[model samples]
Target chain A: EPVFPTPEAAEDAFYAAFEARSLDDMMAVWARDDHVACIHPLAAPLNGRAAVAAGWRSMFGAAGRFRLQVKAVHEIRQADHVIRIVDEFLTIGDETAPRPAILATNVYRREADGWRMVLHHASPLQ
Target chain B: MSEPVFPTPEAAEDAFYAAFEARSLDDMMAVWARDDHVACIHPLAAPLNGRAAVAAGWRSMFGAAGRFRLQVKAVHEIRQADHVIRIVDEFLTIGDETAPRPAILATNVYRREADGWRMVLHHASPLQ
Candidate 1:
């Protein structure tokens, strides 16, 4: 894995995998170990590869096709981890719908594979 | 004392018992730890000195209370420890207005502590 040449590239790949709705691909964005973690704000923190993958699977299982518009991004690429503040929304179904979707700040980590999700903090704005 | 520090502290205490609601004054401010060497955005992440100061800030928030609703959102993201990012939705209102409202974004952090856990940071700020 080493490290992705660029955080944005890794992030792009992650989003692409997500848009592809390929659970396999999305899971690829993360390290293949249980030590890997993911937290969706209030939801219980899922630690390790198995639990993290299960969490994503559950979400994808529940929701329909989704897309995002990443707004503000504050990134701090460290030696092995990259922290980013990305403000984005999910387009559940149609593109023509004019509505403010849930806002999210996604955090990503690098691993033996490439880069996997560390955290995805999101909330709806009213 | 009865795990005063909530897994995810106040929303107005994150919507959980913490800080302003703590039995001990010092423990109350753990959520708003000293602002330096720490990361914060809202209110400029004031360099909170002693726990007393942190308590004061929270007490003020609790005192100036209104409709401070917090909707905790969890997004799994970490690979070593419990590195979690909470997307908290904060809403504030004073029961009377033509339109519009005010609120802030508070990011809560928790680390493995000897006795269960303690808050590592609290960052809150005005949101658009």
Candidate 2:
């Protein structure tokens, strides 16, 4: 298990693991708590750590590597939590044209180990 | 402008849907925090940053669209001392329409402010 010192570090690892298509690395960035949640673009929400990990597992199994470009739009930091709003530009596999930019809100909680992701809600910009 | 104080996150959430169904921009803005860090992402729309932008987004929606009845089902909740994250399913219906539209998954964040609980984030997307 890896420890992310800051929310930014955890966010970076999340995208890195996403681009690398590493299920293990991806799950590592997420908190082990059952309250963890994830919602992919235009997809149903996945509740709890098990469901979130399963969602990622299915995606990793079916999808190719993603080249992601993330730009922070807003941030809110507190004693125990941090929320980041970002825009994600993605190009998958050998595709030259990137998909529509995605608006994502990621929430990180300071757990015993370190900062870990608890919520990842992403939606496509129309 | 007078603002409503929400003693609980659930109270604030109730006011949110009420304002939305009523198409009252003033009431909607009152439910949100005055802080600039507030954000809103409407279905199929880009993220709106800041309280001003969020108000503007809602104003535009109210001006362009008809009244909506939102039936919210609380799916999950994460409560902290100062912050609360709520996941809900919103079933929307147009004026006098019996059949509901597609369900929307929404993540609403509320923060305890000096006044009371106020909304800081609302990210909603249609579940397809």
Candidate 3:
């Protein structure tokens, strides 16, 4: 895994890692800085890198594998940060049809190396 | 009741909570932008999009909730020139309680507008 030059590239890697079931690869896309947070659907917010990593590790057990289709609502580029609001449609295990969608707001910040994920707030669409 | 232009995102966020505390529908609606993309997701509820839908949702909630207070804590701010993201823990107090109620994680996104910074999205869910 290499540093993602753009937030779009990083976002691509995010789904790739999830589909690849590579925990390390998944964590690599995230920022090493503080204030990093992840919110799973109906779950408590996970803060800091270690906590987020552990949270994902736990989720991977029950999650299995799925194809993630991200439909971007908007991409807001700021001075040092970028926010992508996406509606994620996932194909659950052994299913070709898309499951219930998840609305997520992913924020990436520019680090010394490149753009890295600072926060991921995702919720199931109702 | 339209509010004065909020110079900063914090100002708009402050007004949002203030409006909630006051249970003033006018003030609450005032804090939100009229853009169609604006969305509000209440805890355990569907997303409310646009000005009319969001306002109606809030009106319903405000009317249903009786004498509640909001205690916001664990504030984390990520601010840029045109946008701001706030991660906060909100404790809603119903009636009289010895301690604050359970916490909910709230993500408030504010966008800069001609009038001032206005709330574009408010997504909150239970912490647990």
Candidate 4:
């Protein structure tokens, strides 16, 4: 597993993995704890690391490659946790136009190894 | 302004819903953190950043949307040293409507501050 020195690095790896559609790389950015969760846009919340990985796997298999343009709105850094609020503009497959921005709250926890994502709560701006 | 201290994350969460149901902006703001990092995202709305923005967002919603009851079902909870993450299913009822609308999935984050536990982030979206 790769060590993410900072929360930004972990987030970068997550988006990179998403664009690459590599489930292995995607899961690598997540914490190994069972409390980790991911909630995609308007989708049901996937709790636990196993469920999160499976959800990513299903998404990677079903959806086309995703390219994200993320803009950080605010961030809070604590000793053991970091919370980042961002807007994600996604371009799917070979589409030229980007989709409506999605508001996301991403939480990263610092473990012995390094920073790992604990939660990804994203919702579309309807 | 002095705010109520919430001993636990659940306590703060309960107050959050209570304030919402009662449409008291003061109580609603009291449930949130005083820090600038506080954020909120209403269902299908853009993110409201900073404590002031979050407060204003709630105030506007309370004034416009009228009183609504939230039936929250706790789905998951992650407790850490300084933060607690809670995922819940929110069923809303307005006025005399007994039937709950479609469920909304909410991720609420609370941080243990000097005073007590306070909400830092609230991101909610309607589940399809």
Q: Evaluated with DockQ, which candidate comes out highest?
A: 4
Residue-level lDDT of model 1, residues B65-116, one tens digit each, is: 6543333333332224433334344454344654435544555554443333
Scored against the true structure, residue B3 in model 2 reaches a CA lDDT of: 58
Regarding DockQ, does 1 or 2 come out ahead?
2
lDDT for each candidate structure: 0.51, 0.89, 0.82, 0.89
| Runs of candidate 1 exceeding 4 Å displacement | A1-3, A40-42, A76-78, A110-115, B1-60, B66-128
lDDT of 2 by residue, B1-128 (tens): 55579999999999999999888998999999878888898998878889889999999999988766778899888777788999999998888898888889999999887768999999999887
Off by over 4 Å in 4: none
Off by over 4 Å in 3: A1-6, A73-81, A90-99, A110-114, B33-36, B79-83, B95-101, B111-117
lDDT of 3 by residue, B39-103 (tens): 78787665776789888998998898889888887567666566688888998878887678889
Q: Which residue segments of model 2 deviate by more than 4 Å? A: none
Q: Candidate 3, after superposition: displacement of residue A80 in Å?
A: 4.9
Superposed on the true chain A, the predicted chain A of model 1 yields a TM-score of 0.75
Clashing pairs in 2: none
Among all windows of 10 consecutive residues in model 4 chain A, the one with the lowest summed lDDT is A61-70
Q: Of the candidates shown, which would achieve the greatest TM-score relative to the real structure?
A: 4
Q: For candidate 1, lDDT tens digit of each residue in A1-126?
A: 334555566677667766666778777666555545554533435667777778778877887877766665344444455555555566767677535744444556555545656555454444
Local accuracy of candidate 4 as per-residue lDDT tens digits, B9-113: 999999998898888989998988888888889999988888889989988988898667888899998889799999999998887899998899999999998
TM-score between predicted and true chain B, model 3? 0.93
Evaluate model 2 with DockQ and give the value: 0.78
The 10-residue segment with the lowest total lDDT in model 2 chain B: B64-73
